[PDB]
Amino acid sequence: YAHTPELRHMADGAAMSLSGQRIPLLKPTLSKWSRQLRSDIYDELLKLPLRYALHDFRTLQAHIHASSGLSSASPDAPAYYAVAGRDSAVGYAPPLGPADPVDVIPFFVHRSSNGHLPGKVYSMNAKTLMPAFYMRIQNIEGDMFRFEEELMKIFPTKKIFVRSHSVYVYNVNLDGRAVLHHWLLGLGF
């Protein structure tokens, strides 16, 4: 379909600067600070065979009455008193707890002192600036081995290792970081 001479606009994210309106239609946008979520990533997690039924993408949204409805920060009816931790245009929201009230998840991930999730993408031999990255899930707790297994059903072909404190997943760029959170979000953590 070269008859449409437009579509040049869909181009790349490699060899060319990517920013603003031109952000790749596959590349997620979940950063450390803007916890943006995506429905594409969430279906991969919802169409995969796993235990621990994730949370419905309906009851997972932190973002989609005096003067015809007021914001979700509990701005009160007087359109005056409002409450501190109730609305967040950056995507922040506390955990929702596991979705199955009959199951005991064997691992508990612990958000950090700033409300993050334990996955951080490092580089192998950063001295030479080698573009070979892995992950590390530092705040795991519980039966972290039965946490390793669930990562296999998501990442079947990634060399996954486990120590007492962390869980390394190798060859996982900034994208496999996002895909990890949507799991730990939907998981109720």
Binding site: W33, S34, A84, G85, D87, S88, V90, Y92, N114, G115
Partner: peptide, 17 residues
């Protein structure tokens, strides 16, 4: 200073709006 780093610290509870 990212703006999204600020809006994340007023709902975390570090900044009193």
């Amino acid at each position: 200073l990212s703006l999204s780093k600020l809006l994340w610290a007023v709902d975390t509870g570090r900044l009193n709006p």
